[PDB]
Amino acid sequence: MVDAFLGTWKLVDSKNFDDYMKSLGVGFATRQVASMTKPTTIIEKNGDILTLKTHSTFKNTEISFKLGVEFDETTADDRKVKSIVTLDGGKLVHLQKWDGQETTLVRELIDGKLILTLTHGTAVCTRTYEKEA
Ligand SMILES: CCCCCCCC/C=C\CCCCCCCCCCCCCC(=O)O
């Protein structure tokens, strides 16, 4: 069910990421650096466990989870959140909750590209990733 998401992916387009980061309270200097960063995202499975790595010079993250089972997460911007990742409509939907707030990270495949839609508050960011061979 998750298999077309698996592999190594490179950021090739970003829309409204500054809006999204600002909504989360990320400071201006961090937003500068992030606006010029192109992460690599690696999604792997081993049985029922998925591991999602996000790699960049000034920040790396890694999470492991089972679909549909809540996990604790500490995000790149140091929020301590309660997370769950599920498939919905063929999309990989990651929901983070903290302090009564929520954000969603939705991944879908369109024409072989991985489209990541990030929503917090009213801010909606769309990041496009291309698969590495
Ligand atoms: C690893 C996060 C994405 C790249 C960040 C580059 C800038 C690093 C500079 C300082 C460290 C703190 C950065 C925090 C940035 C905002 C994070 C917001 C939540 C995660 C967004 C993931 C986006 C993606 O998956 O494409």
CB 5 within 8 A of CB 109: yes
Burial class (CB in 10 A: 0-12, 13-18, 19+), 31: middle
CB 66 within 8 A of CB 50: yes
The residue among 68, 65, 95 whose CA lies nearest residue 81 is 95
Ligand 1 close to Cβ of residue 75 (< 6 A) = yes
Which atom of ligand 1 is nearest the CA belonging to 129?
26
Mapped onto helix, strand or coil, the DSSP state of residue 55 is: strand
Which atom of ligand 1 is nearest the CA belonging to 55?
1
Domains assigned to the chain:
3-128 (2.40.128.20)
Method: X-ray
CA-CA distances (angstroms) from residue 82 to 41, 45, 50, 97? 21, 21, 17, 5
Residue 125 to residue 21: CA distance in whole angstroms: 9
- Token pair for 125: 């960011």
- Mutation pick for ligand 1 pocket among 13, 17, 40, 54 (CB with most ligand atoms within 8 Å): 54
CB 129 within 8 A of CB 18: no
DSSP string, 8-40: EEEEEEEESHHHHHHHTT--HHHHHHHHT---E
